[PDB]
């Protein structure tokens, strides 16, 4: 890391995101409808009592492969052990793209992938599709029709082996087409 930190003079003020995260943590403590207190495993919970600010209050990482961390994950207040940026999982294996078929589950979506199958006797093709279940971190929000890029992780449920890592929005009320990519 050859270069070192150019000089803005509003940095320490702009770290008011510390009180932001702190009061979000203290709001989670008051929602007595919950049964478990949710917290990241990478973070002490004694760093919140301190005032010198010297220690970070939220954990995040980079996933590699030229995919950059969204700022909504860096400055969010949610808890997700299955989020690839702020949870306890990793991305490795195949990386694919598809379209959102359904977003009706809890932090889970269905993805529709399209492809062609050649039949040699008839010298022609047929159009085919498959459905893939994927995990949706709160740092993204999607609707049906949007393009997504998903990447492989370890097994996460009976049907899920992938995680949403990029979103390309698609306007509502547009003609739905084959769109293989």
């Amino acid at each position: 890391r050859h270069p070192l930190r150019p000089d803005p003079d509003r940095e320490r003020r702009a770290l008011e995101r510390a009180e932001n995260l702190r009061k979000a943590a203290y709001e989670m403590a008051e929602n007595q409808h919950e049964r478990a207190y949710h917290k990241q495993s990478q973070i002490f919970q004694g760093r919140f009592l301190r005032k010198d600010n010297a220690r970070c209050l939220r954990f995040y990482k980079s996933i590699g492969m030229g995919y950059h961390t969204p700022i909504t994950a860096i400055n969010g207040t949610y808890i997700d052990k299955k989020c690839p940026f702020t949870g306890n999982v990793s991305i490795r294996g195949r990386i694919l793209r598809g379209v959102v078929h359904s977003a009706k589950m809890q932090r889970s979506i269905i993805v529709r992938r399209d492809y062609l199958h050649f039949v040699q006797k008839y010298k022609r093709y047929e159009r085919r599709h498959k459905h893939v279940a994927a995990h949706l971190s709160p740092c993204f929000r999607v609707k049906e029709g949007d393009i997504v890029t998903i990447g492989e992780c370890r097994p996460l449920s009976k049907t899920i082996r992938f995680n949403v890592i990029k979103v390309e929005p698609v306007s509502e009320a547009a003609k739905k087409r084959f769109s293989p990519f």
Partner: protein, 72 residues
């Protein structure tokens, strides 16, 4: 063109052939499975049995004879 064309119609071309294959009497006899059930020999070259009677059988219209046979 009385048949579908087009670069993405392989599924239709296969469905049509699968459906119309059964219209042929040879294919239907050899592939349906009812003839195998009804066949006295059960799909074999030959079979052994015991004779229960001796008989004579008339021939058909333009011929005249008594053919010799056995109930088995």
């Amino acid at each position: 063109m009385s048949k579908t064309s087009g670069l993405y119609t392989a599924r239709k071309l296969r469905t049509v052939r699968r459906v119309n294959r059964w219209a042929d009497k040879k294919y239907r006899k050899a592939h349906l499975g009812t003839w195998l059930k009804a066949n006295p020999l059960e799909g074999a070259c030959m079979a052994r049995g015991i004779v229960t009677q001796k008989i004579g059988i008339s021939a058909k219209q333009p011929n005249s004879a008594v053919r010799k046979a056995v109930r088995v």
